[PDB]
Paper text:
The histone variant CENP-A is the epigenetic determinant for the centromere, where it is interspersed with canonical H3 to form a specialized chromatin structure that nucleates the kinetochore. As one of two pillars for kinetochore assembly at the centromere, CENP-N recognizes the CENP-A nucleosome through its amino-terminal region, while forming a heterodimer with CENP-L through its carboxy-terminal region to recruit other CCAN proteins. Here we demonstrate that the human CENP-A-interacting protein CENP-N promotes the stacking of CENP-A-containing mononucleosomes and nucleosomal arrays through a previously undefined interaction between the α6 helix of CENP-N with the DNA of a neighboring nucleosome. Overall, our data suggest that CENP-N, as one of the key proteins of the inner kinetochore, stabilizes, organizes, and compacts centromeric chromatin in a way that depends on its specific interaction with CENP-A nucleosomes and on its DNA-directed interactions with a neighboring nucleosome.
Numbering used by the authors:
A (entry chain F): 24 to 101
B (entry chain B): 23 to 101
C (entry chain A): 46 to 134
D (entry chain E): 45 to 135
E (entry chain D), F (entry chain H): 33 to 124
G (entry chain C): 14 to 112
H (entry chain G): 15 to 114
Amino acid sequence: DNIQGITKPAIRRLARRGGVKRISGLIYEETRGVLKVFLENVIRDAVTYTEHAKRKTVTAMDVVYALKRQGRTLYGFG
Amino acid sequence: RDNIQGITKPAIRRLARRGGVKRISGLIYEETRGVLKVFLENVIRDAVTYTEHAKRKTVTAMDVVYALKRQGRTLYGFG
Amino acid sequence: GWLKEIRKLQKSTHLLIRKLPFSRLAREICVKFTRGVDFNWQAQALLALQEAAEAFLVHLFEDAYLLTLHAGRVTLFPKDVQLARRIRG
Amino acid sequence: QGWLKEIRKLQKSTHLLIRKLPFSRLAREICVKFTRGVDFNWQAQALLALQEAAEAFLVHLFEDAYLLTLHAGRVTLFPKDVQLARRIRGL
Amino acid sequence: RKESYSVYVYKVLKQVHPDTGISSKAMGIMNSFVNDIFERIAGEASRLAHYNKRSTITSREIQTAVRLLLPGELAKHAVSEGTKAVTKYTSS
Amino acid sequence: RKESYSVYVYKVLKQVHPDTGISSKAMGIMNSFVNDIFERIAGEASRLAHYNKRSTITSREIQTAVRLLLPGELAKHAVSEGTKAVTKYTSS
Amino acid sequence: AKSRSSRAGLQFPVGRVHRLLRKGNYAERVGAGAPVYLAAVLEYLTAEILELAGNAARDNKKTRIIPRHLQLAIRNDEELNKLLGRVTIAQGGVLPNIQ
Amino acid sequence: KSRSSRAGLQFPVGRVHRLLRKGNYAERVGAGAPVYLAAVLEYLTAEILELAGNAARDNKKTRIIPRHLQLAIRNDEELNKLLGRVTIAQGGVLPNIQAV
DNA sequence: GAGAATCCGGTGCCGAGGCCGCTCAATTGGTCGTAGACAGCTCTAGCACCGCTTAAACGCACGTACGCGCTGTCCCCCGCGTTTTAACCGCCAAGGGGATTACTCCCTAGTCTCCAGGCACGTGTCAGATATATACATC
DNA sequence: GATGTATATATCTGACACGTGCCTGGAGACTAGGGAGTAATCCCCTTGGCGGTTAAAACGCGGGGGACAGCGCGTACGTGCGTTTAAGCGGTGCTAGAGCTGTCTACGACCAATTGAGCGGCCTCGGCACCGGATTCTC
């Protein structure tokens, strides 16, 4: 598997936070799809920094800098 | 004396035909005249600042290009 | 009817809003954000304002018309334009 | 009812709505496919950072895409709504 | 050996509030706030040292960067407060 | 006295095309293209001289900036072409 | 023998901002009056957002600031929402927003 | 003996190195970087102008005009993501028609 | 008109703030090159206006293509109860590599010096623009 | 089948590809000193695993809630057409305003001593998170 960990009540709670009253059924695929096409664009944009400073360890600052360059600025974890 | 009605009733129609809209409604003619105005403020207030800083009473093209680049909508063709 | 009008306007490239009303509108709005001072626009920069305004309005009405076909409409109501700005942010 | 209590409850607390280890195994699976062969160490704070970003992004996406279901008269989301909401932005 | 901005935010909070404590996590947010705004303004004013073909950063460029990077009323209060700080800095 | 990039774009166009002319307005677009990408890459690689606490810009930082600022296949072709230029630059 | 912030009448530092603005390579020459002004601007921004946060902190009968209070103090105010638009505060949650 | 012709390029190298010295980007600039930079810029310029010239050829005109760059950018997939926040003067749009 | 939602109290617990040692980075002070404020002069390109003229907008009358509320039908998510399951907590070992220091060396920066390239200027001349006129495509 | 719909050419019109003069920014040379690349090290942060629990997810089921399809009235919008108004050409004037060329001075880098402001480690104790209890609310 390694994608079915994002289960139905997980996406259901993610929707109920957003104010969605009534949810259809096909969403539980497309959301997983869009989740993957999000995380890929955060991963490699992180790991290039990890390949620049020649270390085998992704620090938290690398992910913060990848999200900085991506557009969604993250606070706190710096 | 109207001062925003230089935007006409069919110029909005020409922009909607370029956008590809088959049939405009009514009060759009009173709505778009709002929105454009707001957008021009967030250029011109952002473009009168740069020319205020360089002690110039002339608002050149580079100033509007820089303001549009700062807003996020990059313009190329002039300079 | 309209179908000979769209395919003529998505072919050309010239300006649609006339130059002098847009110049008077820009000189009106500019004098409020500078504490009552005139300026002197170069004859090139007004083209830049007008091109950015045309591109922004055309992209806006394309997205608004993408909203209108969702709700079964063909007509473009003012409920549609004031919603395609809150989504885009 | 029921949902009217759950919207009031989940918008109050500030927990993590996604479990830790499935999200961590997914992030490691994606990280393996790029620049293969070697593994990649993750600090324990970086996965929490990426999880907070992904949760905030998905909640903002559903809350933004819900406004195109009240607009059509419906109540219920559809994948057309989510794909159109991504079509509007340009992501 | 790795500095931060926790002490100064704590002093400002004890100035404008009598005893309101702040947790050790939310203080971290304040670090990533004010290592960020300083990246914008003192970044963006550097750009205004390049369009006018200069090489300095005086108070006037930071003033215009604050006029750009902030919305209206907050920018008016900030530009009204900054020159008030500078004038009592000059007559030392 | 005010330089531009018209001559070089004209040389590249006469290289990869026999006689395709280019107007004096669209050439201006190319100026504002390639005074822009150079602002991104050679801007953004400067940021990678700051996160790793360095002070130089070598070829490796520009290589990583090209790996970031471009989508996949175009970035692969660009990184394959740039080192091909550098290797025949080194043995001068 | 005499502090820079004490001449400035401020609370944020001045020498540290000047050190970062030289070492950051923003310009090859740094005017003297600039980082005092910049530190005053940063002090006013942090003072505004903490002044808005503490009222919501006392509104929830608390005296210790958690990130939810900063989230609410950002999102309820209009002009800070204009400023901090594309920022996801960690451990934050969302506003109470129904229908 | 020029550094443009020594590496076999067409974009200049001395001008790019001059703009990296006086651009306030780092305190020291290496020698292996700006040749790489000019090569990448030359590849992107050729990538645009090939599609622009082909679209100009298919419209039976021997001159490049900004409508042709508009068509070449908005029809290509990679430059749609590279230039996704770009307005072009004298641009026009794509021929977009859609029904119900 | 009573299970559910809200406020309240008690108790463990654990991180937030006070405290000390210390060190290195910010202060003070004197030196010198120079970046830029300041003045004045010169070309230029933007604004005001006006006459014309004419292309397009304006105003209206009308036919009718969608907007919308209604309603019937059928399907389809949500709440509920039971069973199953994997996430987590706490621990324990261990080891891969992240951070630190040394040391040489090498590679870029500065200054000087020489000249080939890229820019402004000027000009015939081909590419297309628009315009008219004439051979096909069609509801 | 008349109305578009594509094509031949008329010529005319100006942008533009090109040729020349020329000023100055790019190349050659070389010293020198800090940046850093390589080598070693030691701890410290991460990875792997045992084990037991307990919330949390999966799965049938039925039932109301909602989406969807047709449909009639009608009204707000497109279109046709005469007018009248404002927009464009273009031409004149013509002067405020970019800019740029010197200057001289206040001003900020640059540098040696020195000390306290702020950072690292530590230790509570009150604030708070959770658990259990007493007072309201709509179907």
